Structures are given as structure tokens and as C-alpha cells.
Amino acid sequence: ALVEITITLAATYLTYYIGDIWLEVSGVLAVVVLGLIVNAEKTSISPEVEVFLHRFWEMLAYLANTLIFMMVGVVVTQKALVAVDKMDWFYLIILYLAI
Amino acid sequence: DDLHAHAPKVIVFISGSCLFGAISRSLFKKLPIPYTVVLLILGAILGVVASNVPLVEEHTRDVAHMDPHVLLQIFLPVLIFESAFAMDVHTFMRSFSQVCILALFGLVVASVLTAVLAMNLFNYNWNFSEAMMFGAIMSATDPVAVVALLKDLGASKQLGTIIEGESLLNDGCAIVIFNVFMKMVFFPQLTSTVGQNVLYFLQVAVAGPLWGYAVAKVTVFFLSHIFNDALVEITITLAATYLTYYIGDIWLEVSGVLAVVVLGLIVNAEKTSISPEVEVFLHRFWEMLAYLANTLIFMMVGVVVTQKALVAVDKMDWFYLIILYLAITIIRGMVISLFSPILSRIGYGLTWRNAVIMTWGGLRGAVGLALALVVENLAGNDVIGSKFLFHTAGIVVLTLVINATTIQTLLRILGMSDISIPKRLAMAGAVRRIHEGQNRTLNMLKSDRFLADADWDIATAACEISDPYSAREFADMMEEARLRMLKAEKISYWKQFEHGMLAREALRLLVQHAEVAADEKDQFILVDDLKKSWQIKGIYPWLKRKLEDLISEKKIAAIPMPKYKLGKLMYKICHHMAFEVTINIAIVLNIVPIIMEFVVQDKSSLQKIEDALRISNYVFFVIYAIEAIVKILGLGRHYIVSHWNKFDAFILVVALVDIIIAETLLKGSITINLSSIKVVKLFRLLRGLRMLRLTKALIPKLILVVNGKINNQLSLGYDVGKGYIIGEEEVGKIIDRMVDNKKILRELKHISETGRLQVVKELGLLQREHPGIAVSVKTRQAIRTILNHSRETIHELQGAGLLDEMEAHKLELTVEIKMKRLMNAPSSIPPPPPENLLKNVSWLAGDMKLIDFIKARASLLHFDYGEVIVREGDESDGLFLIVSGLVKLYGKSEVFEDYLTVGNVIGEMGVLTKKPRNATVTCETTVQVYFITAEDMNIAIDTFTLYPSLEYRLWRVVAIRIATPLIMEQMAFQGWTQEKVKLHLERGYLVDLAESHFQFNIDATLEDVILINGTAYNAHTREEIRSPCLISRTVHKLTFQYTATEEPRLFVVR
Amino acid sequence: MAGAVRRIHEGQNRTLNMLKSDRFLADADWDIATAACEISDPYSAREFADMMEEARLRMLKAEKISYWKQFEHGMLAREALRLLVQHAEVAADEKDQFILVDDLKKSWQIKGIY
Amino acid sequence: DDLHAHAPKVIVFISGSCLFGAISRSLFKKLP
Ligand SMILES: CCCCCCCCCCCCCCCCCC(=O)OC[C@H](COP(=O)(O)O)OC(=O)CCCCCCCCCCCCCCCCC
Ligand SMILES: CCCCCCCCCCCCCCCCCC(=O)OC[C@H](COP(=O)(O)O)OC(=O)CCCCCCCCCCCCCCCCC
């Protein structure tokens, strides 16, 4: 099981890194295709291994989301709120309606 | 990217390390060589390649040159916590002293000897500190392969546990000593005063475990209150581990490794708080993290060594490496042999073969490599940089190549890998049964029509499942009978455990007792003289602590309600919990002012600080005075009645005196005399005593925890006893089937019955001693059983297809949440009053009119020791309900003897059949009984004749009581557990004999029918039958006739 | 859901009676009758044509149960089960037409032509 | 540590973020 999980992790990260830096190519699309293909042919993985993998990836995504959300607040409060006018809130409302 | 853009290149290195580790693991699965050696070789090759090609250098520069702090803080906690988590905590604690002594003393002696050897033999001019660091690095072990082998061969589980615990403690202590001497060497700090050194040692050696214990308690408490959240639990575990290590090591300098070890052990022990699936996931998660860390370290060390250490090396370094390997191998064995007497005469002891296996299993691991890398990075001189890493890597490689490869051969030579003959026979039987089943399924498949063209070569590819392993008479008969009893007990215990009633610790205890009895010659398992006493005992100053806590808590039972003024309002305010909350809040607020004042004394900011402190002190004094006014008033002298309030009054008086003295200090009093004017500490230090006023609340909570622990102990003991009882019963029936030789069945049955009766009496007395915890234990068992059966019903409904997955998952989640909430329940419960006990009796339970007829009737009787409630042969004239106490029944029914306790009835059969008493019952303790007269019982039965008549319910209870032994005897190894038979009999019903001559067809649906008390006949033979007896399938048809002397009562099922 | 909750309640009552009949567990507090995890049910809260509709729905349910049992035994797979359930539901939605017309709805999979 | 010793301070931030996320998830389970 350890070998399978490590293979999945290394494959994902190597795919993204190599595709984006060397032989410049859309890394995000490659990772999307790789994930979809692995999801389709998931019978190769053992049952318990896939059961573990689902929760593992869910937890990793949760960690990433939490980190990004925590960081954005600090950065905004330290930099963006310094520069703002009375019309920016009006523009924000208009933009919300427009989108 | 352009200009100065740093694309993280560590990602490529880490991913490549993982890929190489996977390849090495897959390729060398069969070869004895560990894959870590291959990893080291690959790392060395990569380093040599990178030393020439500039491009590869950039991708192996920031990972092969990590700052030591990052390396430690990122990798050590993972390894330590994984090692602590994986271990079996209970077996480790059962022999804690042995492991502690071994680890600590052996590590110290080995490090000292290795340091002296390095100082003398080696030509390097090293001082004692460097040699001690060297020895500490070289004295750390990591026995994974040996533990795995010992586990898989299934020999000496205690040996594997001992090895694991010793390795863990060795790693912790080695890290501690290495940190101490590294600080001594690379960061000299002036002199070393005796007091400063003593304080430093006390801190590093005590504050660590305490900090870890506190963190573990808090984290476990928080985890116990999480329902339906796996991500939260996993994140909490990770954050707790890393925060513990980081905070303990950096802020409030303390041994982080020890704290993490303690936290991991504590979390492992109390892992019932975590949900099942969550813990199953956590095990694999931590295992994978540890594997990743090991792979990364092993890959890094090879590159670093090939790039730095191999540059500086002479022809004598290899000779020194060989000598050092020999010396450490000799030293480990010498230490183990020397400490053998102490840990053998006491503790568990050791055998010479076990000592040899332990000596040869000391494989160095990754902790030594990490410490060597830290040392190498901390210096720029060869005399300590190259030599340390070179020797460490050489020793690691030599150990892995030689000891790991030859451990299996060493095990074989000692003859510790043999296979027990019974295990081989069981495996052969299982394989034969599997083959028979496969052949039957193959025939069924062949008979099919849609599958006839399928190639039948699959008979070879059908997964044969080839069996592994390749390949005066009285004394022997008694040995065989003893072994048969052992096997029967093991099967009964294992069935009970699988059904979810035997628990885990109880099962281990029973299996160990059975195995020890088997090892001994001519002695039945479970002597019960003392081997079943301590668990039931639960005696230790913890009970003394409980008594002291109970005695300390004292207060006035009641206080008069004065009519002057408002009255009730003031008393309610004073006695309301709001008063206690306000007192606690005031104490907490004043605690901060005391700390601030102490810090200020020890050390316009000063003016503001002084003004704030004075204002806070005045506010706290005013609040305390108001709280005192709330009391005293109305209570009057009662306020001084409780000695506890004296401390509060003294604290308030002292605070007021200090405040008054500090406010003006001009009126007079002391003034010139030595006072707060010259030394104001007495005016502030005593303020800390106010915190002691909160101890009143601490006493109750503490009691709680103590009770908790007591409960647990008692709980376990209780359960174990029950197990044994049940087991004996099963073996009873089993003992009837086999042996077949007279004068032996007595040999087994006498011991079995004696042990059963002794355990029953012990359990009854133990319950009588502690009326509270028993109620909680019984309630918990009832809830667990009900929830288990509800979950089984939900599973059956889902399987039948009548419930979709959404509803099934909802119900399962509800059940799981309720079970988890149950796992956290009060330790003790108040025993119910007798009235509810009478109201809860099963047979009369239901209609409230019957309960009224009973409660308005009946009577309560008190008895003392040796009082004979009933005389043998005395006419049945009333019932009995044990509302408290314990009684012993003796008589002939085989002179059967038994014990009864609270919530049991006695004379049902006499009232239902008007027969003389069965056995004489005598009180073994002051007892209380409910005596319902026979005449009143007959009046009640006559009055109530609804469809579920009282007489019908009583007869149903009696019939179900009688039937169970017969059905159990029917179990001639078939397997019924003596409980599933109860459920099977529950669905039954009494015979509704409207006409005397019913012919109940004996169809396959009815299963079995029992003759409770009556005469039944066959359709053809009409053979006379007298109850009690089982009709048996021989009597094909069951006719009937109207008997006269005895009214015929039959129990039937369908 | 109501039927399942009633069945669970009946099973719990039977188990409670069995436990009460026991001897080693008589002092245990029976307040559990309330704390026994009641499992409260969620959600709070011309004749020929109708008879034919009822018969069609009964056939739908029988087919669903058969497919579910076969899949649980490990023979119906998942994609096949999804196809069968979708066909049953679509037939139920339509009026006066048995599931699995088989005219074309059971052809492409057998076809395998491209 | 002394002189130029970089104790990784990222660990504290990441662990605190995880703790705050857990607290927020637990507290607002019912709130929309
Ligand atoms: C192998 C696992 C799957 C594939 C990889 C997963 C993701 C890998 C990245 C993990 C987070 C670390 C990012 C690297 C740090 C950013 C800065 C940097 O690299 O520049 C050098 C960075 C910048 O500072 P300077 O070079 O001193 O100027 O160098 C340092 O001082 C710090 C050294 C960074 C590398 C430390 C070793 C890696 C730590 C994590 C252990 C391995 C991952 C554990 C498993 C994770 C998944 C479960
Ligand atoms: C929350 C999870 C459990 C607790 C924490 C787990 C372990 C945390 C450390 C993970 C590896 C990163 C170590 C830090 C990098 C070393 C250098 C450094 O910090 O100095 C600043 C480092 C040194 O270079 P300078 O500051 O530019 O001179 O700064 C950088 O340029 C790189 C920025 C490093 C921080 C990147 C953010 C963290 C990346 C990983 C994402 C979070 C963890 C994912 C989950 C892992 C567990 C499953």
C-alpha cells in the first residue's frame, strides 16, 4: 500500500512540475487528464488502498484550502486595505451584480 | 520565469527519492538484502554524478545542505510519534520496569564504554565530550526487521514488545544525551555552577514528560467530543504532535523528544475516543509518513557522504571501522549479560537464546544518521565532520548487510522457528475443507447451462491454495483430556470475543491462562485461587485517595431561612451556583494581578502600571467583601460553622489589611516599623493564597477521576469473571461429549464447578461492596447489546433491498453517534430505589393496575447474617425479591449450590405448582426481601385473565428458564453460544391447549419443541412421556390428551 | 422509512425483553428505555387504469429488488445495475409501459460496433 | 541555537492554521 500511495503522489507532482517547467506545456490540463484517467481505471488499485486514498486526498485538499484562506486574510489586511477609496465599495457592489 | 525567479527544485528531488524507494522495494522483495542498502548505493551514485555535472548539482543542493534545525524539527517528531503509536502499549506497561532499567542503564554504560574506546583506540585526539557524543550517536538502535520476523513466526510476543520498548526508550535517551553534549561542545557557556546544572537537569528530565502529559490530556479531552468529523481528528493529531515538539523544544526549553514520546503513548492507550475507521486510517497514515522520512534521510546521507566524507579518509579508517564494529557488538552483549541477573531475578527474566537474539538484533537506523548529519553540518573541520559521518554510515551499512541477512539463519540454528504440530494439522484440515468447498462449487458451476464453454483449465488456475509449511495410559489420557479442555475454553472465549462480549484484555488473560495451564503438567486452567483475584480486587491507595477526598469534603447539611428582610432571595443568591462562578471569576482575575505584582517587584509606564494594579486590587477586595456580605448575613454563626470558610475570611482580612496599609500609611500602626514600606512582599505574596480558595472545587472533580479509574479496574475485573463463568458452562456440555471414560469426567467437573461457584461468590460480594459502579456497568452493557442488535437489523434490512443506501447510511450514522456518546458516560450511577425495582419486574411489568395491586400489597423484610429465609421442604407460601444483599441456595435437585443477588425472584415454581420448597436459602449478608403471599398471588391471577394473562407470563418465564439447558445440551459441538439459543427460544410460545387432543404438525418450520411440565404422546406409538424432557425428532407426530394430576405445559417454536 | 423505524423499534423491544429476563442484569437502570437510541424517524411529519399502474409499479419494485440482491451477491456489477435502475425509473415515469422495452434499449451494449 | 540559527517558524503558523480551522468547523456545524 505504501508503494502505491507514494507512486500516486510522485506521479502527480512530477507530472505537474516537468510539464510546466521543462518542455513548456499546460501543467494543469495534464494533471486533470491524469487524475481523470486514474479515476476511470481504478480497478488496478486494491480496495482498501483506494478507500485510504480517497480520504488522504480529501484531507490534503482541506489542508490546502485552509492554508490559502488563512493567508489571504493576513495579506489583504496588511496591504490592500491601505489603498482604498469610498468608490471601491460601490464598484464592488456593481461588479457583484454584473457577474 | 525570468530575472530572479526561484522554481522550487526540492520537489524533483523528493519525488525522485520516492520513485527510487518504490523501485527498490519492488525489485528486492525476495532478496534478503534490505532495500535501504540499495537506497544508500543510489544516493552515493547520484552524489558522484552531481559532483561532475553542474546541472544535477542545482537539483541536489538545497536538500543535501539543509540547516540542522530544519532537519530535526521536521523529521524527528514524525519518527518518534510513529514508533510510539505503533507499539502495543498494554503489554509494554505490563513489564515497564524491565524495559526502563534495560534501556536507561544499558544505554548509559554502552555510551560510556564506546566513548572511552574511541578516546583510546583511535588516533584522533578527542576530548571526553566529543567521545561521549560519539557514543550517544552509536548507541541508538532500530530493530524493525527483527520485530517483524518475531511477529510473523508467532513466537515470544513479549520478546518483540520488549525489543520495541527498549528501542523507543533508547532513541529518546540518546537524543537527550546528544543534545546535552552538543550544547556543551559547540556552544560553550562560561562555567557551570552546581545549582545551575542541577536546575538544567531537572528541567530537561522532568518538565518534558509533564508537558507531554498535559498536552495529551487536553488533546484526548477535545477528541472525545468530536462526532462525524475525520478530517478534524486527523488534523488535530498532526497539529498536536508538531506543536508539542516545537513549543517544548524552543520556548520554555524542555526535552521535546520525551514529551512527544509520552504524548504518543498516552494517545495510543486511550484510543477508544477516536472512531474505528479514523484510527484505521491513522495507522496507515503515520506508517506512510515514517516511511517517507526514512527514505528521504537515507537518500540524503549517501549524497552528503559521497560529496564530503570520502574526500578525507586514510588506510587506517577502515581498520578502525572494523574494530569499532567488533567492539560495539561485544559491548552490547556484555551489558545485556551483566544486567541479566537483576532483570531475571525480578521482573520477567531472560533466557540465553533470547539474550543472543537481542544481542544480534541491534541494527542501527536513521536517528544516528540524522544526528551525524547535524554534527557534520555544525562543523567545518575534518577531525569531527568527516569521521563522524563516515563511521556512522559504515556501521549502518555493515549492520544492515550482515546482521539483517544472518538473523534468519541464527534463528534457525537456535531452533526457534519450528512449527507446532497442532498448527500444521489445523492448517492441513483447513486446506482440505477449502478444497472440498471449491470442488462442490466447481460441480455446481459445471451443471449450469450458460457456463459450459468456459475453459476448465481453471481447475489448475482455480487457486488451489496450496497449504504452506511444505512438509500408565491414565497419565496420557489425562493429558489429552486437559488439552481438550484447553481447546474448548479457547474456542468458547474466542466465540464470545467475536460476538463482542469478551472484550480484548479479558480474552488475552484467558488465553494466557489456558496456555500456561497447558504448559504445566496435570493442572487445569484457571486455578482461581489467586489468578482471578487481583482484577476483582482493585485495591490500592487509590481507594485511600478516594476516602481522603470524601472525608475532606464537608459542609453544613442545612441552614435556617431567616424571616428578617427579604429572606429567601438572599439565601438563594448565596447558595446559587452564580455565587461560586463569581468567586471563581474573582479569584482568576486576582491571580493575574498577583503575577503582575510579583514580576514588577522582581524586575510613564511605571505610574500607569501601579495605578492599574492598585485599581485591580481595590476592585478585587471590594468584590471579596461583597461576597462575604452575601454570606454571613442570614447564615449568621453558620458562616463560621464551616472551617473552610475560615480560610476565605482570613484571606479577605489579609487582603483588606494590606490594601489599607498601602493606601495611606500615614494614620499610624506600623509606619516606621518594618512593614510593606521597606518590604512590601508580605503585602502581595500572601495574595497568592487567595488562589488556594479555589481548591474547594478541585476536591470534587479529583474524586470523579479517581472514581473513573476505580470503575475501569472494577469494570474489567467484572467482565473477565463473567466470561469465565459463561465459558465453563459451555465446556460443561462439551466435556460430556468427549472423553467417555468414567472417573475422569468427575476430575474435570469438580474443578469446573468449584471455580465457577467461587468466582460467582466473589463477584457478588464485590458488587455488594460498591453498589454504584455495578449499575453503571450493567447499564453500559445493556446499551451496547441493544445498539449492536439494532445495527444488525439495519444491515439486514439494507441487504434485503427494502432500504436505499441513503436511509441506511443515515441510520448507521445515528447509531454510531449514539454509541460514541455512550463511550463517554458517568463513571458511577445512584442505585434505584426499591419501588422502581419492584415496578420493573418483567412478568408483572405492563398494566399499571397490577403494579398498584402489588405495591398496595406486599411487605418488606430485613434479615441479618445466617438467617434462614426458607427451610427445605417448607410449603411454598410466597415469593421473594432480593432488593439488596446476597443469598446462598443449597440442596438436592447432584447437591447443587448457587448464589443469588439483587433483582431476583425465588419461589415462582412453588406458587405456580404448589410444591414443597426446592433448596434451603441462607443469607450471606444483611438482606432485604419483598414477600408477596401465595394467597394474594392467586387472587391477582384470578382477577387478571386478559390475553397476556399474568399466569401465562409467569409460565412463559418458567418455561424459558427450564428450556435453555436442554437446547444447550443439544449442542454437540454444533455451536450455539448459550445466548443465541436464548433469542431462538424468545420467539417461542406456550401451548394454547383449547382441546386436549391437538395434533401439532411437526414441520421443518417449527424446529424444536420442549415438554416443560406435562404428558404428551405420539400419533402412532403414543409413548408415555414425563417432563422435563425434549420431545426429539424421533416422535414424528405430537398428539395430546387431557391429563388430570399435572396440567400439561408445553413450549413450542416455529 | 416509517416501516424501517417500526421494525427497528420491534427488534429493540424484543432485545430489551430478553435482557430483562436475564439474571446477572436486573439491577441495571432501565431508564435506557429512553436512552436506548430510539432512532426517531427523520422527515418529522375506470379502476382498471389505476390497477394497471399499481401492477406496473409493483413490477418496477420487484425488478429493483432483484437487481439489488444480484449486485449485493456480486454478480450485477455497477454499470449494469445503474442501467437497470435507470430503465426501471424511466418506465415508472412513463405511463402504461413496462420497463425494459428491449426494442433498442438493450441493443447498443450488445452491439459493440464502431 | 545561537549566532545565525533559523528555527523554522513556518511550523507554528501551519499548526495554528490547522487548529483554527478545526475550531471553526466544530463551532459552526449548525450555523448556515
Ligand atoms: C514526495 C511527496 C510527494 C511529492 C512532493 C510533495 C510536496 C513537496 C513540497 C513540500 C513542502 C516543502 C516545499 C519546499 C520549501 C520551499 C522553499 C525551498 O524549497 O527552497 C529552499 C529553501 C529556501 O531557503 P534558502 O535556500 O536557505 O535561501 O531552503 C531552505 O532554507 C529550506 C529547505 C527546504 C527543503 C526542506 C526539505 C523538505 C521539507 C519537507 C519534507 C519532505 C516532504 C514531506 C512529505 C509531504 C507530503 C505528505
Ligand atoms: C499542518 C500540518 C502538520 C504540522 C506541520 C507539518 C510540517 C510542516 C513543514 C513542511 C515542510 C516545509 C518546511 C519549511 C521550509 C523550510 C524553510 C522555511 O520555512 O524558511 C522559509 C523559506 C526560506 O527561504 P527565504 O525565507 O526565502 O530565505 O522561505 C522560502 O523562500 C520558502 C517558503 C517556505 C514555506 C512554504 C509554505 C509551506 C509549504 C508546505 C505546505 C504546508 C504543509 C503541507 C502539509 C504537510 C503535512 C501533510
Author numbering:
A (entry chain B): 297 to 395
B (entry chain A): 68 to 538, 573 to 704, 723 to 1012, 1030 to 1190
C (entry chain B): 494 to 538, 573 to 641
D (entry chain B): 68 to 99
Show passages lifted from the paper.
The maps obtained in nanodiscs showed poor map density for the VSDs. With a subset of particles processed in C1 symmetry, the map density of the VSD in nanodiscs was improved to confirm the same overall positioning of the VSD as in detergent, but with no clear side-chain map density. The cryo-EM maps for the transporter module were at a higher resolution in some regions of the nanodisc reconstruction, with a local resolution of up to 2.5 Å in most regions. In the nanodisc structure, cryo-EM map density at a local resolution of 2.5 Å supported the modelling of two phosphatidic acid (PA) lipids at the dimerization interface. The presence of PA lipids probably stabilized a more compacted SLC9C1 homodimer in the nanodisc structure, which was evident by the repositioning of helices at the dimerization interface. However, in the presence of PA, His73 interacts with the lipid, and the TM2′–TM3′ extracellular region has rearranged to coordinate the PA headgroup through water-bridged His132 and Asp129. The lipid-induced rearrangement observed in SLC9C1 is centred around an extracellular helical motif (ECH1) that is not present in the NHE119, NHE335 and NHE918 structures. In DDM/CHS, the SLC9C1 protein migrated as both a dimer and monomer. The purified SLC9C1 protein was further heated at 45 °C for 10 min in the presence of PA, PC, PS or PE lipid, yet only the addition of PA improved the resistance of SLC9C1 to heat denaturation.
